[PDB]
Design an enzyme around this catalytic site. Structure first.
Site, PDB file in Angstrom:
ATOM      1  N   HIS A   1       3.553  -6.689 -22.470  1.00 52.25           N
ATOM      2  CA  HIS A   1       2.578  -5.811 -23.088  1.00 52.25           C
ATOM      3  C   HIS A   1       2.365  -6.038 -24.578  1.00 52.25           C
ATOM      4  O   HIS A   1       1.248  -6.368 -24.968  1.00 52.25           O
ATOM      5  CB  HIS A   1       2.904  -4.341 -22.813  1.00 52.25           C
ATOM      6  CG  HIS A   1       3.004  -3.988 -21.360  1.00 52.25           C
ATOM      7  ND1 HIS A   1       2.098  -4.458 -20.433  1.00 52.25           N
ATOM      8  CD2 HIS A   1       3.901  -3.203 -20.724  1.00 52.25           C
ATOM      9  CE1 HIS A   1       2.504  -3.989 -19.267  1.00 52.25           C
ATOM     10  NE2 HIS A   1       3.581  -3.230 -19.396  1.00 52.25           N
TER      11      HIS A   1
ATOM     12  N   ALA B   1       0.805  -1.230   0.000  1.00 49.20           N
ATOM     13  CA  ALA B   1       0.000   0.000   0.000  1.00 49.20           C
ATOM     14  C   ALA B   1       0.833   1.273   0.000  1.00 49.20           C
ATOM     15  O   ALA B   1       0.347   2.327  -0.424  1.00 49.20           O
ATOM     16  CB  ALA B   1      -0.916   0.004   1.203  1.00 49.20           C
TER      17      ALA B   1
END
Ligand SMILES: [Cl-]
Ligand SMILES: [Cl-]
Ligand SMILES: [Cl-]
Ligand SMILES: [Cl-]
Ligand SMILES: [Cl-]
Ligand SMILES: [Cl-]
Ligand SMILES: [Cl-]
Ligand SMILES: [Cl-]
Ligand SMILES: [Cl-]
Ligand SMILES: [Cl-]
Ligand SMILES: [Cl-]
Ligand SMILES: [Cl-]
Ligand SMILES: [Cl-]
Ligand SMILES: [Cl-]
Ligand SMILES: [Cl-]
Ligand SMILES: [Cl-]
Ligand SMILES: [Cl-]
Ligand SMILES: [Cl-]
Ligand SMILES: [Cl-]
Ligand SMILES: [Cl-]
Ligand SMILES: [Cl-]
Ligand SMILES: [Cl-]
Ligand SMILES: [Cl-]
Lengths: 494, 487, 490, 494
Positions: free
Chosen positions: D258, D25
């Site tokens: 990608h 986080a």
């Protein structure tokens, strides 16, 4: 066993007389190919009962009946079935000694033609004259001027057609001058430029194979075809009369004319109709899109003496000049610059003094990569025009039995096995078509130009000594460099 | 010449139903040929298990069994040696005591093995009547199975596989807890025929057929089954089945799946069987309006009696001995291509062929040409030929129809194996590709069940035809109207 | 005005003779197009525009300033050139059947040709025949007899307007009547659709692009639709229409030209005869339209009363069965188009003004099924000259879910070009001696052969002519016929 | 203007409690991409009213409410429409300090989750737990072992799904070891390997474009396509954080993951259905047929300082080791060995410090040689995934007006100019799909292996110092050698 000849002449040849004049009757071509084809057409009953075959040459003839019986009749072929008709057919042939440049000698020929035409018992007055020019190229324009000047029929009294034999120049410029020299002499309609390949049973079937069948139609383009190979092989050399060849070469002799005709029929678009004009327009169209053969994309050979000594070297011929670099062999890679043939390599092969006699077309399809990979290989459509007439499709199939593997097979059609018909010589067809006024299997003025334009840059490079001519033993497969070139060009062997 | 996998561990081939007509006529002869080919191990144990209480097994093996063996002019010396491998056992298909007796015997044979692995592989050939099937399967699964990590167990299962989707689904559910799909080898003998096994190679190893195998080039696909024989004597069995359930649902649908499937991801069994299921799942269910049915009457002369003349056949039976159907495959490859499936008994000839009819090339030949056709004949004489148009040979410019032929009897010296030799071998080699998969079976019944039910409700007309004739006249008109151009 | 005049038009005189100058076509389409080509500098500044008509008008200068100049369009940019251009126009009263009047025409052209200050002594003659069809052969015989330019002194080109007969026999007659009068080379048969920006782009769209080239055949195309819609009826000129009908007026000529360009094979080159040879070739393979495969309509009064019924026109005969609407299914019998249905639509007094081409591709059945629908290439020639390809795409966002989208090209949005009228192009092409966008003698025969069996069945009272309210979409039977013919909408 | 959030949560997520645990986080990825996407999903009303967002990291907290308000909320985007919901959404977020290796702290994580799950007022007991692993790769297997050991839900009481971020190894071997280390820990179904490109509007539309339309379906193979180009361009460099890039390179960072995802979607066969495994099976299938990239068929670059001095050189970064040959640019030619793509060249481009920000796909079709020749040029299908989302087909048309010449035009579709919809970030889609249990846009274990197999021989050659890395000024188009390579590879420039 001897049998009657039917009166099966085409009805368009019945009403008026018929005079077939063979100019150059003394020549090798007339004795070996023209008179034998006329004999077969007479035996088939395809010529009138009362035809007049007139031989005309510079050769003096002491006994025309001995020449007819001994020399001429010797070259006739089905003599176990048609030997009895030899006499009757030879009774139709007459001979005439005359020059190829003197007008009186041309007035003589016409007066004889008028004399034969007056003998006709049929309906229409006048006569139809077919002239077969089997002469050396140094007398060609002389004859054409002479025949046009005063050996022509009167207007509205019969057609006059001219069968013309190769050579048609030596390149674009020399050919173009010959076409211009003939333009004021005769109409394009009356000129029948012979290329005997267009009379071969397998060459005549190309157009049907391709456009009467969806199986070949759907597959006949760059999406399915990987490579197209055209092969000419001869066991015979260029001996005795090899000085005649030195001036020509393998490209001018076989590739420019014969194999380019096969190339035009294999690559053309679908014709608007089966008319002569509609077919020849597609032939010119594709030939006009063939990129000129480049010296870098070719291999040349000249035969040396055979391994044992049976066949002597090309240069051993006394007619052949000292240190001649004339190619007796050639392999070329050609590109057709259009949307059907973009990227498809065309491999054209022609050679003398090789391992075998061969004339075939090989349409090699793309591999099917998956799921078989190495368990499969390119399909190929093979059309073999000679020695034995066959058409076969090479495919991959499961190995018959309890063994789960693949093998190469063929879906064959062999004409000797399938049909009882004793096939006609290329000259029987062509001569017949010329009498029937059908121009489709005859080189058109523009079709000829388009052909020379592909090979002239290459022929000139060769003549300037820019392209290397590799040696090969007579009876061998040709130079080893040629098979590597073929591989690199796109053809995967089997 | 045995598979190295089969060398290591014992091999026991148990033929359940050894007294039955299929076992003597097809199973034991195929085993003999594999033994002769050296494809089976020399110390193989062939165990016949049936209800017959036969006294002299050696006489049954020599007189009855050996009588059906075929290449006896070439490999008939091995009859004795092979028959020495066969043993027989009388037993019940419903009593655990008779299967415990079976497991006991297979174990007494497995222990006799002189090879490396102490276990033993079991192949069970279930040539039984369908009323005892689940009984046997439960018994075999309960206590005739091989211990873990001591040899595989493979079950060859014979038709019928139900009578429609519901009855078949029932049977598949009854077998699901008993054995795993991998262990089940559902036989359809057409997948063992030399010409049926070549479909996949013809189609996907060749660009000529690959490029042409879709709606753009193909106009019509016909699958034909013809038999000169009727329901000769055994008409009471057929009456309950009909021509669709007998031939069309199983045999000709297998040919349909191989002819219509997409290119497989690999040549693995599941990759091939996945494409078969995939296409079958896109076949629109056969509709009663798009079909013709027949039932044979007596032959023009009297040689072959009528279907109803058989005493085994019930009075006033409307059972079809003939059927022609038009099928539609609802996918982008086959959209608009009609599929004509034909099967009939008491016809003019014995035939099994596939006909791929290509679109006409309208111009420039028009009437001077006709549709090309790729014909694959699976029997009487294994041939593959492509019908084309060519110039009439000689001094004439006309056209004629010709063929680029491949005739297996003319081209090859190989004495081809029976369909059961291949499949039995493949089952020993653990190759499932030519065996009906659970889902492949469901997909097949889904095509014919709406039609079969309509027929059984008396909704479809069954036309008569003389034995030896070509079938009802309505059938040829239907074929024409369906899309197939005659010559 | 630039000197953008072609060099062949420069050396020799130029005389454009408009036969039928008092006609509605001349003032509404010919003279305005000539003005634009003069303004664009495509015409010599010393051009002679000679109006020849039966009208005995007194004041030509008033006709030129008030009547003629009224129809000129870019007057905010080219209003100043009106005077200069009109100074080039002259008028001449004369008959269409008297040799003395054509001699008087020849006399005038020669006087004009003698006035030329350029190098050559001859003069180029372009004749625009905007005449009623009863005087056509009369004029052609008169012009050929003695209004032709001397040999080796300039070309004589003849622009000819429709009607070109009423069927195969009447058209064949007219072609034979003209054969001894002029060489086909000199004859420029106008069909103004071949001058429309979107019709002129068909050949490029089709043969300069692999995307359309690969897709342009029966394997990918499911349906081809050609549509013509007009909000206008006969409105005054009903008797003028009654003798022709919608098939003879729009379908036989205009929409068959679009049909030929959409269906032809790839040309051997971009030459006129190479293009026109492919047009004739395909038209010769269209099966003649059959009465069973068509729907006909005749408009009644509009729902409210604004537009009166077709039969309410006094020029229209009582109880006329003339179709003001027609939908047809056509079949092209060749290997590219076998099985592809062609739906040709033309009607007057409909819901909108439209002229478009619709190429509907086959459905992609799997994996999307109902989540997709046939792609469509739409070429709209008017009201707003455009080209768009209709496709299926994922619904943008956090959804999936498909939707129908378009890859559009709108000419009024993307280009600052103010396109020329159809008559500017063709008149120019006729001066440039370019025959590609002109109906060839054989191309005309091939067109009539498709519709004559149908036109005759209609004229014999064999085909039913259904009514439809003006402003509506036409008879309901037509939409069902279109659906059943092979076309799907949403 | 501020508006109420609907209760538009998918019904399958309504029944049982939901705990989204963001491991890492404090990380740059969570604050820049994860928490902003969660905020948009909350605002859309796509998450339950009572979700529990639990941030877990090593970083000690001094004030979570300040971190939430100042740091986190700063990265939220539609604040002119959704600024009012910031407070409500942030009220759902909680934070937890703890290690990535000690069980002690995974017991605490499980303890807090059960506490939150027990608070649920809905029907079903237990809870669905989604774990977002935004951690450095040195702690990955540590976390996975800890989470699997004791942070899993009770059996039959709710699903446990793991979102996993790149890197997925550095080559085939290192990737394979990581997949084997995870095999006993979780089932393949529960692992959601993120590649954010599979969440981009234009990448998600590939499958529809290709298989819902006959126009693209008929054209999507070697017969019509001449070349396929995939481009990634970035104006940004490796500014500040170059040390991490040095270890990765442009191939491992962009090309392997990608652009190979785009390659798989562009080259795959038509799926059996639109199910996840039916789509992912076709992706693996084609990737398994891509020939491994060869060092000879590639161009590499490393950026130097910009012409003016604004952007410093790659090696000017102190984090970057001295004399590093790490490529910041790469262009590759790839071959797909199957019958759809045989002969079609694939050009894959990715570079940093270039002239522009770009992500597009270019499908260049074959030229139409005749009848237009030079008057025409290759059609192209361009799909631009960013900066502006447009799809356009490039064609040839007649020049509008009197002028009878040709010009190049486009049939365009621009998404900002045709739709009113404020499109979601790639992470909104992907997080949503993971909650909806949809695996189609997530890298599968085998799909990952197939990708590494294409680039590992090349990556190893590069790492051995066998491939030359050319310099280029930051802001330029890259090395000049690259455009010549592209030309020679088969791509014809605009
Ligand atoms: Cl010697
Ligand atoms: Cl021979
Ligand atoms: Cl044969
Ligand atoms: Cl030269
Ligand atoms: Cl379905
Ligand atoms: Cl035959
Ligand atoms: Cl054979
Ligand atoms: Cl399964
Ligand atoms: Cl039912
Ligand atoms: Cl016709
Ligand atoms: Cl408009
Ligand atoms: Cl839209
Ligand atoms: Cl626009
Ligand atoms: Cl009629
Ligand atoms: Cl608590
Ligand atoms: Cl779970
Ligand atoms: Cl992993
Ligand atoms: Cl796979
Ligand atoms: Cl592979
Ligand atoms: Cl952006
Ligand atoms: Cl737009
Ligand atoms: Cl896999
Ligand atoms: Cl390596």
């Amino acid at each position: 066993v001897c049998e009657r000849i039917p009166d099966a002449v085409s009805p368009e040849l019945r009403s008026r007389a018929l005079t077939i004049v063979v100019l150059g009757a003394s020549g090798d071509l007339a004795k070996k190919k023209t008179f034998p084809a006329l004999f077969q057409l007479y035996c088939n009953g395809m010529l009138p009962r009362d035809v007049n075959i007139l031989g005309y040459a510079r050769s003096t003839m002491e006994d025309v009946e001995k020449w007819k019986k001994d020399t001429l009749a010797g070259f006739f072929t089905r003599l176990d079935e048609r030997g009895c008709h030899v006499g009757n057919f030879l009774r139709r042939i007459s001979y005439m000694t005359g020059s190829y440049d003197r007008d009186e000698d041309f007035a003589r020929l016409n007066e004889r033609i008028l004399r034969m035409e007056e003998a006709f018992q049929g309906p229409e007055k006048g006569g139809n004259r077919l002239f077969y020019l089997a002469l050396p190229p140094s007398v060609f324009v002389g004859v054409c001027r002479g025949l046009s000047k005063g050996a022509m029929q009167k207007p509205e009294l019969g057609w006059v057609r001219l069968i013309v034999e190769k050579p048609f120049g030596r390149d674009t410029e020399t050919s173009e001058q010959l076409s211009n020299q003939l333009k004021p002499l005769f109409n394009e309609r009356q000129v029948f430029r012979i290329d005997h390949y267009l009379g071969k049973e397998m060459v005549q079937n190309i157009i049907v194979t391709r456009f009467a069948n969806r199986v070949f139609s759907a597959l006949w383009n760059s999406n399915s075809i990987a490579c197209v190979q055209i092969t000419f092989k001869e066991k015979i050399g260029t001996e005795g009369r090899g000085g005649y060849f030195d001036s020509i070469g393998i490209i001018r002799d076989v590739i420019q004319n014969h194999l380019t005709q096969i190339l035009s029929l294999l690559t053309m678009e679908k014709p608007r109709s089966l008319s002569a004009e509609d077919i020849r327009d597609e032939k010119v169209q594709v030939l006009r899109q063939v990129v000129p053969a480049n010296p870098a994309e070719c291999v040349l050979g000249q035969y040396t003496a055979s391994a044992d000594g049976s066949t002597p070297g090309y240069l051993d011929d006394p007619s052949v000049p000292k240190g001649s670099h004339c190619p007796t062999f050639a392999v070329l890679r050609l590109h057709v610059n259009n949307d059907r043939w973009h990227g498809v390599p065309f491999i054209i092969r022609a050679g003398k003094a090789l391992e075998e006699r061969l004339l075939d077309i090989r349409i090699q399809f793309k591999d099917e990569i998956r799921p078989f990979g190495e368990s499969t290989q390119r399909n190929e459509l093979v059309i073999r025009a000679q020695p034995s007439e066959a058409m076969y499709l090479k495919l991959t199939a499961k190995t018959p039995g309890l063994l789960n593997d693949t093998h190469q097979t063929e879906l064959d059609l062999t004409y000797e096995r399938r049909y009882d018909v004793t096939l006609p010589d290329a000259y029987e067809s062509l001569i017949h078509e010329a009498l029937l006024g059908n121009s489709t299997n005859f080189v058109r003025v523009d079709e000829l130009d388009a052909a020379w334009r592909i090979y002239t840059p290459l022929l000139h490079a060769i003549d300037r000594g820019e392209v290397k001519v590799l040696p090969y033993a007579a009876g061998s497969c040709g130079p080893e460099e040629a098979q590597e070139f073929i591989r690199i060009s796109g053809y995967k062997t089997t």
